[PDB]
Amino acid sequence: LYFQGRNVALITGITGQDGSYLAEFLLEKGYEVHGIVRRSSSFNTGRIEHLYKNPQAHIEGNMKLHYGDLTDSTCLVKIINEVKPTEIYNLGAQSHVKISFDLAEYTADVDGVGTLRLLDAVKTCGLINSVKFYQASTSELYGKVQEIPQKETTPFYPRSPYGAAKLYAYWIVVNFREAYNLFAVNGILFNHESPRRGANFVTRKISRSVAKIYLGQLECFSLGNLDAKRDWGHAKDYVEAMWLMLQNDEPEDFVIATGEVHSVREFVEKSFLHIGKTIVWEGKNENEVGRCKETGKVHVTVDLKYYRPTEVDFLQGDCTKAKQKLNWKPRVAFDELVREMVHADVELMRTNPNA
Amino acid sequence: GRNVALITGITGQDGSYLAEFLLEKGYEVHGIVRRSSSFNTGRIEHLYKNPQAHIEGNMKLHYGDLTDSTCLVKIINEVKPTEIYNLGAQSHVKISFDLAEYTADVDGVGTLRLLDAVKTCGLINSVKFYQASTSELYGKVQEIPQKETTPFYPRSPYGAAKLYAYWIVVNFREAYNLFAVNGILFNHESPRRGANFVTRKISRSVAKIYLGQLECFSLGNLDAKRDWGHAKDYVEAMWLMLQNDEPEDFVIATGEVHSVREFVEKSFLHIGKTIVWEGKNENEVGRCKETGKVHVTVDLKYYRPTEVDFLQGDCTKAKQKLNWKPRVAFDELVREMVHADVELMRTNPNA
Amino acid sequence: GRNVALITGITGQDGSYLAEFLLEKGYEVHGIVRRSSSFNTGRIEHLYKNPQAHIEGNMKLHYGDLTDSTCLVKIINEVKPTEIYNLGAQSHVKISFDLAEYTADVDGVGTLRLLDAVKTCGLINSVKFYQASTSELYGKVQEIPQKETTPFYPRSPYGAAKLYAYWIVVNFREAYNLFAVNGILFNHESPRRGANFVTRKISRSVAKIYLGQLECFSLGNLDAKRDWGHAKDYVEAMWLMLQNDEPEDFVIATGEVHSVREFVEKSFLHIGKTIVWEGKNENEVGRCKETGKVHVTVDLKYYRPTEVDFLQGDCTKAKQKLNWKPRVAFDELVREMVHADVELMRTNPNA
Amino acid sequence: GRNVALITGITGQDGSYLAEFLLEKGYEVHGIVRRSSSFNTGRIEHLYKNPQAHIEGNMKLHYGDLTDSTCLVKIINEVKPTEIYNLGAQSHVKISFDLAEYTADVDGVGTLRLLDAVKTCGLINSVKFYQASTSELYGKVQEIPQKETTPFYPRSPYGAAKLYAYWIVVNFREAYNLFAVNGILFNHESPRRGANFVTRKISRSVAKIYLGQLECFSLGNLDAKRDWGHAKDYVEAMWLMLQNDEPEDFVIATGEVHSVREFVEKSFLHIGKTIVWEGKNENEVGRCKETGKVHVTVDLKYYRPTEVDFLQGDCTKAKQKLNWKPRVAFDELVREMVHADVELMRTNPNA
Ligand SMILES: NC(=O)c1ccc[n+]([C@@H]2O[C@H](COP(=O)([O-])OP(=O)(O)OC[C@H]3O[C@@H](n4cnc5c(N)ncnc54)[C@H](OP(=O)(O)O)[C@@H]3O)[C@@H](O)[C@H]2O)c1
Ligand SMILES: NC(=O)c1ccc[n+]([C@@H]2O[C@H](COP(=O)([O-])OP(=O)(O)OC[C@H]3O[C@@H](n4cnc5c(N)ncnc54)[C@H](OP(=O)(O)O)[C@@H]3O)[C@@H](O)[C@H]2O)c1
Ligand SMILES: NC(=O)c1ccc[n+]([C@@H]2O[C@H](COP(=O)([O-])OP(=O)(O)OC[C@H]3O[C@@H](n4cnc5c(N)ncnc54)[C@H](OP(=O)(O)O)[C@@H]3O)[C@@H](O)[C@H]2O)c1
Ligand SMILES: NC(=O)c1ccc[n+]([C@@H]2O[C@H](COP(=O)([O-])OP(=O)(O)OC[C@H]3O[C@@H](n4cnc5c(N)ncnc54)[C@H](OP(=O)(O)O)[C@@H]3O)[C@@H](O)[C@H]2O)c1
Ligand SMILES: Nc1nc2c(ncn2[C@@H]2O[C@H](COP(=O)(O)OP(=O)(O)O[C@H]3O[C@@H](C(F)(F)F)[C@@H](O)[C@@H](O)[C@@H]3O)[C@@H](O)[C@H]2O)c(=O)[nH]1
Ligand SMILES: Nc1nc2c(ncn2[C@@H]2O[C@H](COP(=O)(O)OP(=O)(O)O[C@H]3O[C@@H](C(F)(F)F)[C@@H](O)[C@@H](O)[C@@H]3O)[C@@H](O)[C@H]2O)c(=O)[nH]1
Ligand SMILES: Nc1nc2c(ncn2[C@@H]2O[C@H](COP(=O)(O)OP(=O)(O)O[C@H]3O[C@@H](C(F)(F)F)[C@@H](O)[C@@H](O)[C@@H]3O)[C@@H](O)[C@H]2O)c(=O)[nH]1
Ligand SMILES: Nc1nc2c(ncn2[C@@H]2O[C@H](COP(=O)(O)OP(=O)(O)O[C@H]3O[C@@H](C(F)(F)F)[C@@H](O)[C@@H](O)[C@@H]3O)[C@@H](O)[C@H]2O)c(=O)[nH]1
Ligand SMILES: Nc1nc2c(ncn2[C@@H]2O[C@H](COP(=O)(O)OP(=O)(O)O)[C@@H](O)[C@H]2O)c(=O)[nH]1
Numbered sequence A: 001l002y003f004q005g006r007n008v009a010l011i012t013g014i015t016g017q018d019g020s021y022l023a024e025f026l027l028e029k030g031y032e033v034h035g036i037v038r039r040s041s042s043f044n045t046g047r048i049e050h051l052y053k054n055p056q057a058h059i060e061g062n063m064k065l066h067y068g069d070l071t072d073s074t075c076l077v078k079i080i081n082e083v084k085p086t087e088i089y090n091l092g093a094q095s096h097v098k099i100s101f102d103l104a105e106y107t108a109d110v111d112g113v114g115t116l117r118l119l120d121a122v123k124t125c126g127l128i129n130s131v132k133f134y135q136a137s138t139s140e141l142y143g144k145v146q147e148i149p150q151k152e153t154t155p156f157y158p159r160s161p162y163g164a165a166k167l168y169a170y171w172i173v174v175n176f177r178e179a180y181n182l183f184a185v186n187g188i189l190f191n192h193e194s195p196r197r198g199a200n201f202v203t204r205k206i207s208r209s210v211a212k213i214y215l216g217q218l219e220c221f222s223l224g225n226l227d228a229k230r231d232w233g234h235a236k237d238y239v240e241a242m243w244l245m246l247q248n249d250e251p252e253d254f255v256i257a258t259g260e261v262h263s264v265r266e267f268v269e270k271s272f273l274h275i276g277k278t279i280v281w282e283g284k285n286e287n288e289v290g291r292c293k294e295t296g297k298v299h300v301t302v303d304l305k306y307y308r309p310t311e312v313d314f315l316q317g318d319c320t321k322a323k324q325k326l327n328w329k330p331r332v333a334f335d336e337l338v339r340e341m342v343h344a345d346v347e348l349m350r351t352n353p354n355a
Numbered sequence B, C, D: 001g002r003n004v005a006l007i008t009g010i011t012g013q014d015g016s017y018l019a020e021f022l023l024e025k026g027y028e029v030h031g032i033v034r035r036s037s038s039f040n041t042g043r044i045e046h047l048y049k050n051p052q053a054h055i056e057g058n059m060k061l062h063y064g065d066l067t068d069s070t071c072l073v074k075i076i077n078e079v080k081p082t083e084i085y086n087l088g089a090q091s092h093v094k095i096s097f098d099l100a101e102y103t104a105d106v107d108g109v110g111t112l113r114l115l116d117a118v119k120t121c122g123l124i125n126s127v128k129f130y131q132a133s134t135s136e137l138y139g140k141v142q143e144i145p146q147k148e149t150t151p152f153y154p155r156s157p158y159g160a161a162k163l164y165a166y167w168i169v170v171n172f173r174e175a176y177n178l179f180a181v182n183g184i185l186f187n188h189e190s191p192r193r194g195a196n197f198v199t200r201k202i203s204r205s206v207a208k209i210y211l212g213q214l215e216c217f218s219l220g221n222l223d224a225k226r227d228w229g230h231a232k233d234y235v236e237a238m239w240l241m242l243q244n245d246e247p248e249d250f251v252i253a254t255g256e257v258h259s260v261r262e263f264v265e266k267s268f269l270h271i272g273k274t275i276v277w278e279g280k281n282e283n284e285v286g287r288c289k290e291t292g293k294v295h296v297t298v299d300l301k302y303y304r305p306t307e308v309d310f311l312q313g314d315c316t317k318a319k320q321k322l323n324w325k326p327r328v329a330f331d332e333l334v335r336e337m338v339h340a341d342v343e344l345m346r347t348n349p350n351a
């Protein structure tokens, strides 16, 4: 049964980057934390296995995991009915934009309709007035940005099947809030990174590749659009904002961002500086290369296979509303983020060159 | 010289008028029809070459479903259309609250399945694609009237699914140079409109009352306001949007607003009865002034959890670029629908 | 005790007869109806309390779909049935080859969704569940005649989907002690049979030929042999299966076999014509002895890629345990269908 | 000629051994990999041309999912494989009871999606298709031993989904003349086996106990009896089936039966411990004879609602027609698995 003082979180996507930090953040506050984990042929729990009570035996304590999938309605109802959460964080998703162009229907089913399935499970279980629901929305919703900077009232313009699926999810969450008075909020989070970031997102790809070059495991790597500009924060700061949004007296949507913009090119330059290399760019378009000023070796090339058919050229978030209402502020700035990711990947690649 | 149209949703209101419109222009018209335990082709069976033997001529029908990717690829490969009109949908807003996932799968993901089939079949640079978008996208309207630059604010699972479809069509246009357009059509009605949409519900019920086959019927929100046009005028806009030199999205509307209550009042005037209202909210009833008899009541079961209170479309862009303009105005629409349902109900009291 | 039935597929042939059968026994009958752009309730509209107003009495209808889990849970939680008859299906074998995935989703996974909805609602010990299984499971028959223990060998995507449904029903029975049964029904027909199944296609076409509305029609495999009963007899067997003390699977059939050719011959005799066959394979035609006119041809588009040549059911187990026996035999079934279709086609040549 | 394999499920146990096998035979090997938030390629990363940079040579990987029809068509159309091995599946029986619908969509309908992609792509005449069928199809075994003609009786949602897949493969073979075969493989294990299948759970746990990193572990049904072979031997059989001149289904098994209890006993013997059993049912424990410590308990949460008590395969047909025989017998299998897991746990106590 529900009672005041019992805090029970259900996290979809607990094995991902954000889920892993959010689980840690909520455990520290004394929550019982439940997560939904996909069945996989090998365990996919590497980011959260340190949160077992006994990590050698994989015995659970205050973090409890359940097999499920956002495409299986019955499994979501069974889990929610057993857990009776006070807070639900829907972080599960096919979260990669480039992959969404080749997996557009799967991305729609998980990222769009899966949000509806989870909301519908809350309603089926009779929990509409018992649970607070956080939806992981995204600055990708702004796509071809209609305003600079982007805030909660900037109109959406998605540019991928991922963005379209997340737009459905955004509005179905609003509809449950308005139709049924579910406390449900959209966190419109701008890009956020960490050493736990998926390896094929651009920041982690750069930090991994720079680490491999530093260690002699790699000579060169390829990127797509060097001129893309992004607002990059640290995932550990942003999961705190997710929790603050469910602590708010009223269910409101918020932009969470740093408000500071950098290019992919700058992320590359700063990463290489951390291994003592100055990158000099030469050429243009798909023939642009990044050369080490000291040695003259080409370390970065461009490959059109990494371009997106409809690029998101520029993102910059204005989080004034969150600063005023939630008293949220980012604590990690861009330069520290880059150093932390390169440093962590150098250590990772030293231990395991196949990592 | 080749004009081959493929219409999903050909059995519905709009598909039936669009089929007639394209046949009149000499198109070969193909339609996708759902398997049904009884035939669902009543609106188009007059377009068979031999309607007694159900033998096809220039309108050809194919079993399929917007939730079955393989069947869509198979049909598009066989037909090789030059124009595709995606009119198929679970199109009812109230039903979408109880069938939210089905509505997402057909109206949202089904649009992606059809676009993906176009791409799979190698047609991305030859076919022109029309998406049936909707004024329901404006939902809780952010401007009056609503135009192409008015932000969307959907208010039902139908609206949210159609918003996904709107943007996935834009993405296929922008990513792959598909000639694909969104028709943002405001409400449009006809004697072929589904019986549980408000206008046809009213005209059917008023017809039955005129013929003494019914005494009373119940509605939901009487003060909802809508921009109502005639479906036969609007399918022409769909075709015009694919004739345009460049693929653009357009609002199609009359720009004139009336309430459900006004549709009731005008419908009853056509059968010689003046409705006067008494009471409030779910206790409001509509009584014939001349006889004192109650003919209209309100039932909360017909309300929607999140209502769309007001729609009024501004189709300036379509007027200027497509030269489209509506022909049937509200008063004629009501008269036409009441007259047609009187003729139908005369033939069959159970209709 | 409470007698509340939930019928999926209530608008179909069997659902319409089962609803009548259960209403006569005093049940409250609930059905799940697909949203459709025209109403699909023609077989059951006479069961409204007021058929002119479409007001429900003891038969109550709910919009839903076997591919929407949430909707199924909502309906089962509202209705709390004591008996569930899962008759809803894409039931056409030929169309299943073009709609294989949709047929799997509705006929196979939909049965699982309904069973899971029962379990989700906490009714696993409180409901009896009937699954509409089919002689198509025997496909390439491994025994003649076929009984409950005959090994299955399906021959179409419909057969495969129904076989999944058969085994998931058995698994719910064995794993969770659900009172769930498979009715393995052989072909059953009626004047309400879908028009594109072979028996109704023949009876409709013979009627149209009698009335001068049609000259000729085409069939597929004339040599297919079937065990054909009357749907009205067979819905009684479904009910008897849920009255049984223990959940058991049963074959329901006549045990008598006739060819499609024979059904054609007997149907034409009821309009006073003796059909005489000439030619072979795709060139075979049936000609009226009295007039010399060709009335039947063969068209390969009606062949199935993997035919089911022969079905003959052995219903000894049901005769012994349920005291079930069919009341309508083949000759009376034919007469009834031809007679009903002449009446229908006289009233409407486009029917 | 051209030898290009497409392996779904390449990241799994069998896919990793099959990829190795086909690369050694000179094939270009393509694999479909699911998007995952961390890479799921641990079993095959040594097959990159440069494993430090994850650069591909003769093994090429493609993102996809068996539930996404468009992605399968794109991959198959790009690869143009000569052989397709459908190993991708939710392959865990206990998990299938909680994930019944997902298991149906991937293991059942996903097989149809892959077959339909072959057909869509025009490859029906140029590809050989292997389906990963399973002795779980026999479930409550209807013959002992089980062979190709033994009737199936599945006992889980996994079994039911794989039964759908088996018959849809047969139907593509018979309807469209696709060279498509069902490998009916009995249980096969290796040091790459998923950690929550019973053999690998035992070997992992015995290794952790040996190294003092675990005290005890729990099992479900100790008395279940299985036919266990080595995955490395069995992937050769898959390839042999597609080398056959005619498409036939084959049982692949050892024909030797052992219990879970015996697997436990033999595993502990390899670390120098004699397990002795005391108690009954869920209170049964396995105790070290030497030290008196309890190392094995029983937990009903690992029981399946409908167990498969006994499997024993008869692979006479494969021995005659394929000249296949297993190289690894049960005793060596146990030894290899415990030794491998000891070596793993020495490197990483959290493994
Ligand atoms: N990081 C950003 O910059 C950012 C910005 C805004 C919004 N977002 C959104 O925020 C959320 C978390 O981001 P992230 O960076 O943590 O993404 P991530 O690392 O890619 O984690 C995705 C999670 O979702 C799970 N998942 C995927 N498909 C699923 C399914 N069908 N059913 C259930 N679970 C499934 C994954 O499981 P596996 O481990 O099994 O793959 C993983 O746990 C996502 O919804 C993402 O779209 C991210
Ligand atoms: N009328 C309006 O005021 C209005 C306004 C803007 C946009 N729209 C959109 O315009 C389009 C047509 O409107 P309408 O009034 O003609 O709607 P309609 O009469 O309800 O017709 C709906 C059509 O879609 C078909 N359909 C439904 N589910 C399907 C599925 N799963 N697969 C394939 N076909 C399916 C229906 O087939 P059955 O006959 O088998 O049910 C019917 O042919 C719809 O997309 C509607 O949402 C309508
Ligand atoms: N008649 C036989 O000889 C025979 C023999 C053995 C087994 N069966 C099985 O017995 C059952 C009834 O047979 P029938 O002859 O009555 O079939 P039918 O006339 O084709 O009726 C099929 C019913 O299922 C409904 N339905 C179809 N797809 C649906 C979906 N996605 N969600 C919900 N409902 C859906 C149809 O609704 P619409 O009206 O909207 O299409 C109709 O009510 C079927 O399962 C059939 O496969 C028939
Ligand atoms: N081993 C046996 O004893 C045995 C006996 C007979 C038959 N089988 C069948 O043989 C095949 C392989 O067995 P295994 O032991 O190698 O199983 P496994 O280790 O569990 O591998 C399962 C594979 O399928 C992939 N997969 C899961 N869901 C998928 C999806 N939705 N789309 C695409 N790929 C997906 C998995 O990817 P992730 O790595 O991303 O999870 C993995 O590559 C399976 O079909 C299994 O059912 C096994
Ligand atoms: N541990 C690990 N790391 C990998 C793997 N593949 C790539 N990377 C690292 O990922 C980062 C970005 O590389 P990318 O090419 O931008 O990533 P993609 O995900 O787009 O493509 C990768 O897909 C793989 C998949 F199997 F998923 F299809 C393979 O095809 C691989 O060759 C390809 O690079 C870099 O740091 C890589 O080292 C892998 O299997 N295991
Ligand atoms: N021919 C016909 N007309 C019908 C039928 N049901 C309603 N109407 C007419 O439709 C108009 C609107 O009535 P509504 O109540 O607003 O329509 P809904 O679709 O919301 O609800 C209807 O659903 C039916 C369904 F079976 F689909 F669930 C039944 O439950 C029916 O009782 C209910 O009215 C009016 O003019 C009606 O005459 C029917 O079966 N056959
Ligand atoms: N009332 C009505 N009857 C029809 C219709 N089409 C066929 N029949 C009658 O059905 C019987 C069987 O004919 P079939 O050709 O064996 O039926 P199919 O379902 O295989 O094919 C039919 O499909 C239709 C569909 F639209 F669904 F795709 C059209 O293509 C139609 O031309 C074709 O006959 C006969 O008695 C017919 O008179 C129709 O639209 N309305
Ligand atoms: N490396 C690793 N090994 C694990 C993990 N969990 C279990 N094991 C090992 O698996 C073997 C079998 O254990 P089981 O309990 O029979 O396995 P299940 O898959 O049924 O259940 C497991 O599910 C997990 C999941 F997150 F997936 F839900 C967690 O709940 C975990 O506590 C539970 O054991 C043993 O050798 C374990 O060491 C893990 O996260 N990482
Ligand atoms: N993932 C990825 N992104 C790249 C690459 N090269 C440039 N980018 C750009 O980097 C930006 C951020 O991409 P990503 O990290 O995947 O996050 P996104 O904002 O969700 O698309 C996008 O504009 C990409 O187009 C590359 O090799 N991989």
Ligand SMILES: Nc1nc2c(ncn2[C@@H]2O[C@H](COP(=O)(O)OP(=O)(O)O)[C@@H](O)[C@H]2O)c(=O)[nH]1
Pocket (backbone or CB within 6 Å): B093, B094, B136, B187, B196, B197, B198, B199, B201, B218, B219, B220, B221, B222, B224, B225, B226, B260, B302, B303, B304, B307, B308, B309
């Ligand atoms: N369908 C329907 N709508 C009603 C009824 N009573 C009032 N309305 C209102 O009429 C308006 C138009 O409804 P509808 O014809 O279904 O078309 P919509 O604009 O797409 O929702 C909506 O605001 C409804 O809430 C009723 O009985 N049925």
Ligand SMILES: Nc1nc2c(ncn2[C@@H]2O[C@H](COP(=O)(O)OP(=O)(O)O)[C@@H](O)[C@H]2O)c(=O)[nH]1
Pocket (backbone or CB within 6 Å): C093, C094, C136, C187, C196, C197, C198, C199, C201, C218, C219, C220, C221, C222, C224, C225, C226, C260, C302, C303, C304, C307, C308, C309
């Ligand atoms: N539906 C249909 N079946 C035909 C036709 N001609 C021959 N048949 C055969 O009649 C038999 C019964 O078919 P049908 O009535 O559809 O029921 P089924 O037994 O479920 O396939 C099958 O063997 C068909 O192949 C035809 O024109 N239509």
Ligand SMILES: Nc1nc2c(ncn2[C@@H]2O[C@H](COP(=O)(O)OP(=O)(O)O)[C@@H](O)[C@H]2O)c(=O)[nH]1
Pocket (backbone or CB within 6 Å): D093, D094, D136, D187, D196, D197, D198, D199, D201, D218, D219, D220, D221, D222, D224, D225, D226, D260, D302, D303, D304, D307, D308, D309
């Ligand atoms: N996975 C698993 N199986 C167990 C356990 N204890 C007993 N078994 C039995 O071991 C047998 C083989 O199980 P498994 O390795 O998962 O493969 P399966 O034959 O496909 O079910 C089954 O009869 C299980 O019930 C356990 O803890 N885990």
